[PDB]
Amino acid sequence: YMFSDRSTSLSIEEERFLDAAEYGNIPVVRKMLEECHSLNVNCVDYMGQNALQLAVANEHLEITELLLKKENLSRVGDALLLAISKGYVRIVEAILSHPAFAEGKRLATSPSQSELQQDDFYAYDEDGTRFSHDVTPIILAAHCQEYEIVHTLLRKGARIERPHDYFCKCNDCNQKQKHDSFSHSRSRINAYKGLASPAYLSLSSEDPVMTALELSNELAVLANIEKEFKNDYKKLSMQCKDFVVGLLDLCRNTEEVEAILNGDRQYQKIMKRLIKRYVLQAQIDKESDEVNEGELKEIKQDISSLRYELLEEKSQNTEDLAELIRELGEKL
Amino acid sequence: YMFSDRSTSLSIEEERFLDAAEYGNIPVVRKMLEECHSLNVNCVDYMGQNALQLAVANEHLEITELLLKKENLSRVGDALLLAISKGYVRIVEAILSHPAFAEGKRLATSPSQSELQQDDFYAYDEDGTRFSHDVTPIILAAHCQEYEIVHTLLRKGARIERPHDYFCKCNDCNQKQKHDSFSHSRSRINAYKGLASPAYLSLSSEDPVMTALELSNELAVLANIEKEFKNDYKKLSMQCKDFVVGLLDLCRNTEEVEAILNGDRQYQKIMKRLIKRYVLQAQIDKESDEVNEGELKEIKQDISSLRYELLEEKSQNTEDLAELIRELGEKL
Amino acid sequence: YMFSDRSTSLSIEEERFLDAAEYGNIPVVRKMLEECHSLNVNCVDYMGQNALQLAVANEHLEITELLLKKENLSRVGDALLLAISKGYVRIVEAILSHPAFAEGKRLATSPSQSELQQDDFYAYDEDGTRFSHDVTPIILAAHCQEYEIVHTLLRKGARIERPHDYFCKCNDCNQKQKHDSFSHSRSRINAYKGLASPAYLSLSSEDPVMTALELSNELAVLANIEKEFKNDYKKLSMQCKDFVVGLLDLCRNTEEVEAILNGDRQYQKIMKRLIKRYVLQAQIDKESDEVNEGELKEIKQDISSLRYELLEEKSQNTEDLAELIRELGEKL
Amino acid sequence: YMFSDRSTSLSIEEERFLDAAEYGNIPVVRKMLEECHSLNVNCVDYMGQNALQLAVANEHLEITELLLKKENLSRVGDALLLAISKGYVRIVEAILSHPAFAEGKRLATSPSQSELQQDDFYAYDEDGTRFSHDVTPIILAAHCQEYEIVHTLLRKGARIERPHDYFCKCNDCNQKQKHDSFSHSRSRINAYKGLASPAYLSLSSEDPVMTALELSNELAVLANIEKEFKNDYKKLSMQCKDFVVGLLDLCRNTEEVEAILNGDRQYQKIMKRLIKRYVLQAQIDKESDEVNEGELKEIKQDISSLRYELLEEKSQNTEDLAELIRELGEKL
């Protein structure tokens, strides 16, 4: 009558490996990755998550690099999605060095259809995604509003494609509408929430005030036309108006105020100054929010990882050294 | 006129051992457990708590394993109850390797009556329990709503037995009613709060929506019938309705919505997907609560434990090494 | 025009010593305490506080023990008051091993008058106290409501003496009234706030319900009689009523409820059980408050202390070892 | 279409150096500063910030001292402004040992005009300041209300010059008014907010009650006269009234109350006592605010810095030692 995902009982090797991957015990993971050639690294815990997922979820960077050194690894895309969703920057910039993300071939790609074609890349528990099918890395990065990850995914040449019209009549949109209505509406609202984020507006365009105003008007039209999610499509336009008002408020000089209120070389330079000012201001105001439990969980896990590394390092130190002095003590 | 539990004044050995067990000083606890054969490990502090209780209450895993290596230890069940009540996962999974919990013979057992028979296992200060007598580990795990501990205690084959009817007329229930009324009503409301937790509902049944609805109706009937705790029995049914509404809200596909709203292979697979989705969502929303003082207390105690371990380890390192180079310096 | 307490500019020795005492740099403090015989350990910072005060204020236990090894130290009583006011338990139990607190001769002593006689023990900046003159350690411990410190100061045989009547007519009270009115009223309200704390009520008497009720009635009489602080004297009686209601609420058995509501061997045992239950419950509810900045300041200072200790320890390690291998490399 | 400040793609040397400066990896920064003579230390990240700015923004003191050992460094004044704005005390007291702040020649200097003359000292991204041009270090220290930094900048002999009259008619004020109106009004309100801070009032004058009252009346006059920012000029006067009321509330003796309410040797001593009492009280009440995310970011970065230092130190330890025992093992 029990709910258990792992139907097969877990061996002692997989148990020590998964607790070591959960609590960042780096050197015994090195030992298990080297000496044990019967160690299935695609093992799952009681919930059904991989050692890479357990390593990413607790912010251990070193074991994530060490696991990415292996090549039989799976569910890497969901590890990237989880690291974006919690906002671990170095884990994202280490996962993006995997060969599956070499040319950007999986980051935000509409010609390789994620929802229509069973690509099966972003997946966990071989049965479904951790988010919607329409959610791609840069959409989730815009949803979580973390600026360094958005800039890294933009430097990889991945962007958010604007959704189609409310009645586009092309057979792709008609087929995606006919297969599921609620999923299609959720895809549209998720892509528009990704488009209306201050991170993507600040880092993706060249005239962010113009793009923000056009998006606000377009979201108001899709608000009053569409009946499902009729209020959230107005909240996104309110977020765009909030973004352009925050750009107005961060101006110091009267030249900056006139450059925003006019919009029209010099304008490119003053917009590149104001975008940087707004990014640093929003970074401070994200650093001035109250503290949730997950950050202390990260700190306690990093402390335990430090404990394991230092204890084993000094133990292997005294063994490797006392061997070489034992050779003396026997030799002399 | 002073209140003091330990009537006997504490020796210097017991003082150093209890401060070392309070602040996680691992190696001097190893030294006191080895070199001192007159060390009563059942010593109590000023409050009256054991070294195992002081070690569990501050989250020191290593000294908890080290104390469980000993065999004259007492009050292990209350250490398990305290580790469940604060939610230390590794301490629970290390305490459950003790031989008193080998076959599950003490976890959630109604044929071995905890309230009626003086089992005296879950006890502190030889005079009473840290909770009610009806509180067993999985009931407290459902009360604290921690999912990994509930899954571990369920894998041990322990479950919450449903309480009897409001007038069962069997002589066990009549005797437990005649011995104490307030204690019996508290036992009933504690067991029903354990049954209505989202952790036990999500991890214990096969059709959680059906069990949640049946429990909500049963709790509404026991709400309007019983006069004592007349509102809390409605709050539990409101929690069950909140649980089934949260399951409805976490659906993505229209197939998932239809699978919840109908209830009737494919349904087993879609329920095993939705239960995992709800578990991960509730884990995130538990990780998004504000921070209390006890977590920082845990972090400071782990930092002090790390300090003691590293300082003594490098000190014993330089002594063990400088001895072997002193043998040279005298020999050559 | 500048405000500066230290009129004499600070030498480089005193500067390195005071920054090392501020940030817990243990080994350079050992070096400065040993090799420098011209080091005035009563030096003050820019504010005017001693190295012991700076060491206590940031929770460094090791340098506090090291400074208490010295004997020319001053302002120890204010260090005890500061450690009580922030609630550092081990620093208090280490400061109470100083010879000035050997027999309890300074803890809570009315025959050695603190306000009338210029004892000059609890002092900083040679001009005044960090609190009122009537504030003694156990009064401040009752004000901060920390239970372990109250129990430690009670085991030292220090207690809070009840203030006199509103018109006592003894020449001591008349003289203390004639010297200052506002100071005398503040002394009375501070001593009554110390008497009405749940810590002192729970740890100081044998029948806490009777003492709490008598104190609540006495505080209501002094509320309606006295005009100055007319509402706070009612808030203390409300705190006493809150304490006895919390004792009523923590009862499990009907025997415990009847033992509270009656008050009259068996009653001594059941009160010693309920007092322990209330102490543990209030300790949990103190550990369930939100987090202030000072705890993170303590954690960051302990981290920096750990960094300094480990870095210097491994540096002195490699020097002490490489000397003894250099003797070889030159000898062979 | 991408927004990127660093138009030149970053080399692998600059990448390893900037990630090492971001996450406090001290020894590889030592290695890159020594062995690489083609390392442009004025490199910028994706945002456009220097290695000194990235090192200051995450509170790494050791790499900040190490970078200040170099002499081709730029944007030091904005590093000082950032360290003041986040309130890192040791980083400020280490940056003020740079030769650009030797005699106080850049701290708060009106004869060397910061807004009128293009001094280009406090700058980032070669295009603008992180704050207004009128913002100098002690004005920002008064804005952030951190007392140790205000005292350090006051001991450097830097002060806040009072702004001119609302119509001063001198050609400097007329020219600064004619060049920009909004910038001039922002400069006036920023300087008056710096003057009305409790830190500058408590640490800069000799009779703080008189200065606070004169400033409150002057700010009320500039409130009712000036139309722009008409309410904030009243909020500053309300802050001055709050400051003098807090000084009244912190009095213990009736002599202290009479010394405040009169204002008129003995008065100098009692004001020097009350100013110290208010400073310590405001320091406690700043340490009793809720916790934001940036403090945990500082703690996690210090933990990672400790990890890097200890791991490399023990690695270089075992290499340097095993070389000298290898010389033996080959020699004997």
Curated annotation (Swiss-Prot), chains A, B, C, D:
Spans of repeat ANK: 12-41, 47-76, 78-104, 133-162
Location in the cell: Cell membrane
InterPro entries referenced in this protein's UniProt entry, alphabetically: Ankyrin_rpt (IPR002110), Ankyrin_rpt-contain_sf (IPR036770), Ion_trans_dom (IPR005821), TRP_dom (IPR013555), TRPC6_channel (IPR005462), TRPC_channel (IPR002153)
PTM section of the record: Phosphorylated by FYN, leading to an increase of TRPC6 channel activity.
Tissue specificity annotation: Expressed primarily in placenta, lung, spleen, ovary and small intestine. Expressed in podocytes and is a component of the glomerular slit diaphragm.
Cytoplasmic side: 1-264
Pfam families in UniProt: Ank_2 (PF12796), Ion_trans (PF00520), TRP_2 (PF08344)
Entries under PROSITE patterns matching the protein: ANK_REP_REGION (PS50297), ANK_REPEAT (PS50088)
Resulting phenotype, H133L: In FSGS2; increases calcium ion transport
Effect caused by changing D45A: No effect on RNF24-binding
Family matches, as PANTHER family: SHORT TRANSIENT RECEPTOR POTENTIAL CHANNEL 6, TRANSIENT RECEPTOR POTENTIAL CHANNEL
Cited function: Forms a receptor-activated non-selective calcium permeant cation channel. Probably is operated by a phosphatidylinositol second messenger system activated by receptor tyrosine kinases or G-protein coupled receptors. Activated by diacylglycerol (DAG) in a membrane-delimited fashion, independently of protein kinase C. Seems not to be activated by intracellular calcium store depletion.
Subunit details: Homodimer; forms channel complex. Interacts with MX1 and RNF24.
Pathological association: Focal segmental glomerulosclerosis 2: A renal pathology defined by the presence of segmental sclerosis in glomeruli and resulting in proteinuria, reduced glomerular filtration rate and progressive decline in renal function. Renal insufficiency often progresses to end-stage renal disease, a highly morbid state requiring either dialysis therapy or kidney transplantation.
NCBIfam families (alphabetical): trp
Protein name in the entry: Short transient receptor potential channel 6
Gene that encodes it: TRPC6
